[PDB]
Amino acid sequence: MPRFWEYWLRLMEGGGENLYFQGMSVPTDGAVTTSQIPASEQETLVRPKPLLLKLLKSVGAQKDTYTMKEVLFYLGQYIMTKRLYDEKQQHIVYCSNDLLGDLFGVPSFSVKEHRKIYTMMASMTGGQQMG
Length: 131
Prior knowledge:
Blueprint: H1 4-12, E1 45-46, H2 50-58, E2 66-67, H3 68-82, E3 92-94, H4 99-104, E4 108-110, H5 114-124
Antiparallel strand pairs: 1-2, 3-4
Helix pairs in contact: 1-3
């Protein structure tokens, strides 16, 4: 059986010492979301790029604004269904000349490089790169 999602879950159940040490600054306080029932799980909303929104909608995502955990959740389901992981190195994703490679700006990346994924994902929720 494959193990990609066991690695991807550690991004979402991650943070702390897994955060970046160069480039972007430490992310600001936010959320202020409800907790009136145990079903609550929500955090700060973001505006992901139209190129990423297409990928989220390829796995049936409903909204126009998203949480960082919602974007990662759906993106992990896309990588999972597309089988973009190496069959040997289950913790490494490969995608060139296709939508997920066009998003990440690299032919491949390690899922264990949580710090690098966090800064790349923070760039996807920034302004457009049409040029």
